[PDB]
Structure 1
Amino acid sequence: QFPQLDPATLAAFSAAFRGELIWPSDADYDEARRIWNGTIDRRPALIARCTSTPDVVAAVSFARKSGLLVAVRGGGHSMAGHSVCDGGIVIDLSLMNSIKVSRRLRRARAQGGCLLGAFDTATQAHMLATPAGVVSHTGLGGLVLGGGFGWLSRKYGLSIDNLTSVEIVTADGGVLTASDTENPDLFWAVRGGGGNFGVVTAFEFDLHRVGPVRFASTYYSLDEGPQVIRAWRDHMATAPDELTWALYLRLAPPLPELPADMHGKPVICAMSCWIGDPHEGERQLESILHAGKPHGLTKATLPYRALQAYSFPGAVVPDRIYTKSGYLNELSDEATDTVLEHAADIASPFTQLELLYLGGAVARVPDDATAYPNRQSPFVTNLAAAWMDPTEDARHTAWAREGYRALAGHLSGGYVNFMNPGEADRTREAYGAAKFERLQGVKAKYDPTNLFRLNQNIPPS
């Protein structure tokens, strides 16, 4: 926390760095060191709030020369707590939030500290968009480096499936461009390989015209759980790419569109949208609303930016979280009953068991085309415990582990962006042998000293 640093190397850093520094003595230190996973409480020796690529260069070099453990933070959403370290440096990108958008080229160049909401605002000024996650205050940086999925994915792929190049500052402090024609080995590995390979300071995306989106959300009783999940599973097997439909098993939020009788009870929250013409969307969405008896139905036609900003409306932002996730190739009747059993035990108002269906454009990309594993597994499940009181940490986490272990025979792989702080040992199984090996090769070449290790880490061969 207060390590001795060489004064000369510190002075050099300072003259070269135009951003803001935050030291452990400063009034804003405790707030700046907080990340969205409030169970992570770590005290860096320094927070370096970078404002340009040269800033990031100066910070990487200063960390390398100084031997400080490097944490890189984009939006701070790491479910594993990777964006803050004890005793090291946080290379904080959050003030690097610029997006340039060319309407004529349908192209966006976004800085590596951008929030999704900032990105979506900029592109939707021209009615353009590309795929990213569903929660507006997520960081673009960590999400895209992991793959990145959300509302537009079945139609347009992962965020990485629309990435055309990056600017990246590597461990030696060099700046590189990686694309299909420049450093293509590196460009393959950052598309799903995390922060393993250097600090991405700029992402370039291809964009799509995305007009108003017919959206519906509704709640079903858990009593109809088997019928609704089976309807969903079967429907999605053959659904148009334009339909996206997610199920979130949760306590029903105390909202006026729901009967007060249902408040605080476990329910299925079904969220769905049609990426395409809204009169077609009305017809498609209507055909799936009656999976069970619907309650608290909201239907609306939203600009895409509002659909992005919609998840997940509540009075409280949860302080503490714990996730256990994996992919499924098939969702059997026995797996569904497991899901529903564990759902009924849910305790916190903020906890959910989510069941996502990917496939569509995501699956049509050849497996070896990026470092993202598991394109062929269309289902994702996430036991996302979330709560407030730290005295309850044991009970919440036990809930998520029990559900995972009960589902374990059905699960395969794992999305790097959904790993928790105790899942370092999941990296090889999540990527697979062929992928984990080619990633190690690229690690050996670009970060042979493993300067970047506060991520779902790939050690160099």
Structure 2
Amino acid sequence: QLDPATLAAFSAAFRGELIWPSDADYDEARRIWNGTIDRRPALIARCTSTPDVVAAVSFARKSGLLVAVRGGGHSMAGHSVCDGGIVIDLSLMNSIKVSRRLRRARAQGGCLLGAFDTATQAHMLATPAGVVSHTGLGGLVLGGGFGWLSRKYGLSIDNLTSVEIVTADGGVLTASDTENPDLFWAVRGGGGNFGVVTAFEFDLHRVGPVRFASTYYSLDEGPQVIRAWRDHMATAPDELTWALYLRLAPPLPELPADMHGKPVICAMSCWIGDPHEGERQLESILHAGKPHGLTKATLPYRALQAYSFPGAVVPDRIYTKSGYLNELSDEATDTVLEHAADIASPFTQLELLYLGGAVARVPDDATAYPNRQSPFVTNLAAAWMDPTEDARHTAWAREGYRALAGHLSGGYVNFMNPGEADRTREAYGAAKFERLQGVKAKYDPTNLFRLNQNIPPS
């Protein structure tokens, strides 16, 4: 319960919409993508402008309210909603300005990937981001951001040229390579630790149609397929991206009925470049095993972005355990296949991703993002509907991770689950974590922004 004068100053300054626990849309406004997170904020402030975010940060600081910031609400740790605090909700700040001649996009901090991609593709332009359209740009970029265009053009942060950011003191700063470069280093991988980003500026690239393929392999052939994949990606051109999703086969017409619901490897691949070269490149990796349900298409980049994932179903409840690998040993390969064979929910995926390429050619210390030199990512992404089955699916992800943990290092902060606060130092490493703390001490000394993979100051 709040100070009336502080609240009245807030209401007069704030031009967005405020949602209170008694309002009709409070229950839908406080849900985030991870539906296991059920929390009740004192206030949700739907900002519509940078002055709105200023007023909301300042109101929160003066009132002592625990601050959650929300872009697209996809935090796998549930950081975008809080008990008893204020949600600074950016979802209505979804505007993008694209300059075709300059190959530049300026995107507000609340954009969804699909809105961003629609705007840039109006000019046949693009820049790297994640693979599911309704993910928020904000959290994704601040953690690094990888997807289809990343082996060719780097992480999202490798194309970021500046931000507008509201800091804990209510100030509005620009951070770039020429202005507050210490803060600009930190926001490229350091998350929401340093303030609320209200606008991102990106360099764009011309991206025409891309040759794309998706197919399914039986777990029978898993050893030969995963070994073909890790061997080929070690020397693959930047232009090829190839990812493996172990999952239950979806009940789709392109798959034989006897495969529906059983563990398979879903392989998805694309060529960023000439589609005829892409057709030759993909044809040579599609037959590592017998391809079932093969879909080949020459897609506009916006449609590639909208494709993931097959079955198009939004799960209510999720739990993720992830790490990087420097090498994918045969022992790690067998472990991945044994646990994939035990997947229970049709929405769970054991993801095997290969980064590298342009991501790995950026010097390690040039941004806050850790583990550019590890090309493999494995993600035990459990997802289900029924809340009484939480233990089944959570246990699957935990046991898989534990059996792999010796082969893993680091961790992508954007794949951390609600119980992985203690993983922050191991994810960043000692040198980056220490540098991040010094930037935290300068820009957020009270740790007002602590609903994130948190960096304590000093």
- Equivalent-residue separation in structure 2 for 1:143 and 1:121 (angstroms): 17
CA deviation digits over 1:303-341, x for unaligned, max 9?
Answer: 000000000032531000000000000000110000000
- Equivalent-residue separation in structure 2 for 1:9 and 1:51 (angstroms): 20
CA deviation digits over 1:442-461, x for unaligned, max 9?
Answer: 00000000000000000001
CA deviation digits over 1:268-297, x for unaligned, max 9?
Answer: 000000000000000000000001011000
CA deviation digits over 1:422-458, x for unaligned, max 9?
Answer: 0000000000000000000000000000000000000
Report how far residue 76 of structure 1 moved.
0.1
Name the counterpart of 1:428. 425
Name the counterpart of 1:72. 69
Q: TM-score, normalised by structure 1?
A: 0.99
Unaligned segments of structure 2, at least 5 residues: none
- Equivalent-residue separation in structure 1 for 2:147 and 2:239 (angstroms): 13
- Equivalent-residue separation in structure 1 for 2:273 and 2:256 (angstroms): 32
1:391-410 aligned at under 5 Å gives the runs 391-410=388-407
Deviating 4+ runs (over 6 angstroms): none
- Secondary structure of 1:412's partner? coil
- Equivalent-residue separation in structure 2 for 1:430 and 1:122 (angstroms): 33
- Secondary structure of 1:83's partner? coil
CA deviation digits over 1:135-166, x for unaligned, max 9?
Answer: 00000000000000000000000000000000
CA deviation digits over 1:109-139, x for unaligned, max 9?
Answer: 0000000000000000000000000000000
CA deviation digits over 1:199-247, x for unaligned, max 9?
Answer: 0000000000000000000000000000000000000000010000000
- Secondary structure of 2:23's partner? coil
- Equivalent-residue separation in structure 2 for 1:62 and 1:25 (angstroms): 20
The alignment yields a C-alpha RMSD, in angstroms, of 0.4
- Equivalent-residue separation in structure 2 for 1:332 and 1:399 (angstroms): 21
- Equivalent-residue separation in structure 1 for 2:76 and 2:217 (angstroms): 28
Report how far residue 25 of structure 1 moved.
0.1
- Equivalent-residue separation in structure 2 for 1:128 and 1:231 (angstroms): 33
- Equivalent-residue separation in structure 2 for 1:120 and 1:73 (angstroms): 20
CA deviation digits over 1:35-66, x for unaligned, max 9?
Answer: 00000000000000000000000000000000
- Equivalent-residue separation in structure 2 for 1:394 and 1:326 (angstroms): 21
- Equivalent-residue separation in structure 1 for 2:328 and 2:88 (angstroms): 41
- Equivalent-residue separation in structure 1 for 2:129 and 2:313 (angstroms): 24
Name the counterpart of 1:349. 346
Report how far residue 255 of structure 1 moved.
0.4
Name the counterpart of 2:237. 240
- Equivalent-residue separation in structure 2 for 1:408 and 1:147 (angstroms): 23
Unaligned segments of structure 1, at least 5 residues: none
- Secondary structure of 2:169's partner? coil
- In structure 2, the CA distance between the partners of 1:275 and 1:315, relative to structure 1 (3 Å rule), is closer
- Secondary structure of 2:178's partner? coil
1:214 aligns with 2:199: no
- Equivalent-residue separation in structure 2 for 1:313 and 1:265 (angstroms): 15
Q: TM-score, normalised by structure 2?
A: 1.00
- Secondary structure of 2:183's partner? helix
- Equivalent-residue separation in structure 1 for 2:371 and 2:310 (angstroms): 30
Q: 2:141 aligns with which of 124, 140, 144?
A: 144
CA deviation digits over 1:158-199, x for unaligned, max 9?
Answer: 000000000000000000000001000000000000000000
- Equivalent-residue separation in structure 1 for 2:431 and 2:206 (angstroms): 36
- Equivalent-residue separation in structure 1 for 2:311 and 2:255 (angstroms): 14
- Equivalent-residue separation in structure 1 for 2:393 and 2:234 (angstroms): 33
- Equivalent-residue separation in structure 2 for 1:316 and 1:84 (angstroms): 23
Name the counterpart of 2:40. 43
Name the counterpart of 2:246. 249
CA deviation digits over 1:68-122, x for unaligned, max 9?
Answer: 0000000000000000000000000000000000011100000000000000000
- Secondary structure of 2:315's partner? coil
- Equivalent-residue separation in structure 2 for 1:316 and 1:401 (angstroms): 24
CA deviation digits over 1:390-432, x for unaligned, max 9?
Answer: 1000110010000000001100000000000000000000000
Identity %: 100
- In structure 2, the CA distance between the partners of 1:315 and 1:213, relative to structure 1 (3 Å rule), is closer
Report how far residue 376 of structure 1 moved.
0.2
- Secondary structure of 1:55's partner? helix
- Secondary structure of 1:396's partner? helix
CA deviation digits over 1:360-390, x for unaligned, max 9?
Answer: 0000000000000000000000000000001
Between 6-15 and 309-318, the greater mean CA deviation after superposition: 309-318
- Secondary structure of 2:92's partner? coil
- Equivalent-residue separation in structure 2 for 1:194 and 1:282 (angstroms): 38
- Secondary structure of 2:333's partner? helix
Q: 2:298 aligns with which of 297, 301, 304?
A: 301
- Equivalent-residue separation in structure 2 for 1:356 and 1:44 (angstroms): 36
Name the counterpart of 1:21. 18
